[PDB]
Amino acid sequence: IAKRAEAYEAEYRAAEREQIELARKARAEGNYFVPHEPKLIFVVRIRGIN
Amino acid sequence: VNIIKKRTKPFKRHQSDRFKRVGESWRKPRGIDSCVRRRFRGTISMPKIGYGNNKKTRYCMPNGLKAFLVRNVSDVELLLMHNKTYAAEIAGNVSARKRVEIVEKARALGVKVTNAGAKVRSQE
Amino acid sequence: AHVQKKNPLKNKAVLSRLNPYAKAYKANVKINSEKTPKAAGEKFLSVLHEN
Amino acid sequence: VRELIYKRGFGKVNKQRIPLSDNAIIEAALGKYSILSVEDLIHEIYTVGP
RNA sequence: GUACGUGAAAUUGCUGAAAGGGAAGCAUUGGAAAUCAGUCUUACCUGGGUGAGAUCAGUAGUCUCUCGAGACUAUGCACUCUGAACCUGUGGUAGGUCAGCAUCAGUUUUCGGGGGCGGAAAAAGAAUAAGGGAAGGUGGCUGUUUAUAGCCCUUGUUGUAAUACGUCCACUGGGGACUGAGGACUGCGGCUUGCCAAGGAUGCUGACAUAAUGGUUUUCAAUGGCCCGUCUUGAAACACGGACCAAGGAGUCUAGCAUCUAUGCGAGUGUUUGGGUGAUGAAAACCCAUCCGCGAAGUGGGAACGCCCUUGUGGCGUGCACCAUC
RNA sequence: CUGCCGAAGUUUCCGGAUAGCAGAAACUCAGAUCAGUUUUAUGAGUAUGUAAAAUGAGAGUUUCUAGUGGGCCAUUUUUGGUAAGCAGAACUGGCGAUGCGGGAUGAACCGAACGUGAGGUUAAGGUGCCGGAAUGUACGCUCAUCAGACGAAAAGGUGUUAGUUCAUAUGAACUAGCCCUGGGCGCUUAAGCGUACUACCCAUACCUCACCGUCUGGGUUAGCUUUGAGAAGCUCAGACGAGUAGGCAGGCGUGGAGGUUUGUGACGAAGCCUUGGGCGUGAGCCUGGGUCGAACAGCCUCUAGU
């Protein structure tokens, strides 16, 4: 479990940095890089049952 | 262990203070157009099961004991093992000849009596 | 079991039980030590600095 | 995703709301899918795994 | 005290207390006044001394059960026991209500400190080596171009600047409030058998207790509060019933039918029309001769079980009730 | 008395037989199906129906058995209207069975749907005073000598504010906003109106906890010194809580009967009185004091002129 947790945290850091590096490269090259749409959505109900 | 009472005021019958013919004992309001039944604001409360008290402390006196009605010495001897949970309560119709013998017996048994000084005097 | 629920984000003892990885986390790691190269070409700047 | 699971995380164990106070709760109900801990539950939710 | 057992309510008189600007009125929370429950240290532990006596005797009898188990009797009080009486202990340890603090746990609120990352790898800006320009123009003279003030733009510039903002820290320091459910040990963890903030509060103190804490009644203050039942009507509006109190006052008994449950027996079942019988009430209970009433008149899925055997998985059989197929 | 379920208020044929709605029982199933669901795509004509991916929930029955078998308002759709309004149908929910915060007040408006409570946080609406909460910040608009604040109404204005455009610093034509004319106290660089951003107030709503009850899912016997087997007990966990008609369950009380308490009573039964005390969510029950004077009660069962 501890090894799995470390691997997950390593994956998150690499996935965030690579998004930053891709945007930095596109900004320097003058092109436009569009990040992928997210598959995860957190939905909260705001109105009551009436 | 402390006894918690959700409510201390009794539930009086609606409109029982306006008429002598209507007693204080709680009666469920059957009127459909009654404000008390529909529980408006300012209307009195009604007996609900939510007011029910803790099971562990139910039937317990403020001193932590449960009342046990006693009619003779034989009744008070039953509380030999339950003297820390129950208090002896001599019945109202037990004469003063037996009230004294119940109180003396309950003294050796280590049993609290709720009305031990009734219908008697002292002589030191 | 579980008479009372304890928050791992406040109770460090429960967090150590739930996650056997908090003991070695290193939350703040220095990445940009002494390089920090400004990466914004003139083509991007011209488009941004428009109108 | 991490704070919601840690503070408000409650599993549905046998049609009941059982808080995730132990990894054995998640493992007993999600061990069939190689999910054994709470950070594995967070990883599956965050990265939208299989 | 014949206005005669008990003597309720409505109602009336007097007395006392309190309240009172055109209602009362009830509820919620407290105050005040009056009035109550409501309680206490008194026992435990450990002696020693003294004597005491049995469930104690290097003891003798009786009785009832069944050797030894109870009850006694006589004798001893040495052995054991009696927290056994008292003297000596000046030894110890001391519960209920209300408070204060500390260490914690759950929840929550409110102030900070430090750091990582992102953003034009902030924009500015300072410093700063230059170039150009104009101004709402310094000097020269409105016009003018750094002077006898400077400003703007561009590069350069230290630089890998700082800051703001966003985001993150299983980074950290305080303050406040509300809760303490559960009750040997189990478990999950962290330290190092033990220890712990880890499957829910414990420590350290006090005072008062012999008042505080409460409770009740009256009353005041704040806030709220349209008259009940019936019918009507979405709803109400309504129209009705209600001067007050006491007592009485309305789904009952029975015959038939059907469902359901329980009970008895079961291809049966039902004694009470009657007869027998019943001495202690004999209208009960108990017993049953003859009738009669009502009843009688193969293939699939599947409950359950055995056997396996890659064992779980599935397969091989046996297949109730019931439903589909002939 | 309490608790748990709980409609419908109407299709359809026609006072009804159905059905629907709501429960009971027996069945078979979670490796089976289902949905006031969203899709995909096939077709057909932005939608449409059908068939087969996501999401959620275990589903399908069979039998018989209570009640309803009015509407109001609101939304949308509507056809004609026609002094104008409106009327007419249909479409859909809410109320009708439902309290709560705001809305001055009010049944249809804005929030929110309900066990008993402590703490926290909000919704709608609010923060000058009545009134809990900023006489908050930053811009503007408005002067009324009826503002505003919560149809004569179109327009006119030697009425403004911002002004725009066009003519040659002015004037004309215009562009809008607001004023003039046509809940209370009070407020006027607002306590008015519009915009933006912080802070704050509090509902029965939301979160955490405790307690009550119900429902659901477990555990518990060579009854182990944890002793907690009225197994009709004990115990663990989670969810939930409006309610008329109606359905169901468990309890309180009264007269009499069988049994029982080797029951209470002239040392005071029953009854009544009481700002005495206690118990129960409640029906009710126990008790002190006073009064009183001969009978009476708890428990199991039976019964009813309860």
PDB resolution in Å: 3.0
Q: Are B4 and B10 in contact (CB under 8 A)?
A: no
* Cα-based torsion angle of the residue sequence B36, B41, B47, B52 in order, rounded to the nearest 10 degrees: 170
Angle, CA of B2, B7 and B9, to the nearest 5°: 130
Say how many residues make up chain D: 50
Q: Which of D5, D20, D47 to mutate to test the interface with A (most CBs of A within 10 A)?
A: D47
In chain C, count of helices (H) and strands (E)?
2, 0
- Return the SS3 of A31: coil
User: Domains in chain B: how many in total?
Assistant: 1
CA neighbours closer than 13 Å in the CB half-sphere of residue A50: 0
Domain residues for the domain of B17 are 1-124
Where helices occur in C1-51 by DSSP H, the ranges are: 12-18, 42-48
Q: What's the farthest any 2 CA atoms get from each other in chain D? A: 26
Q: Which of D43, D45, D46, D48 to mutate to test the interface with A (most CBs of A within 10 A)?
A: D43
Q: Which residue is nearest to the C1' sugar atom of E189, using CA?
A: C17
- Phi/psi at D9 (nearest 5 deg)? -75, 120
Distance A32 CA to E36 C1' (A): 87
Q: Are D7 and D19 in contact (CB under 8 A)?
A: no
- Return the SS3 of A36: coil
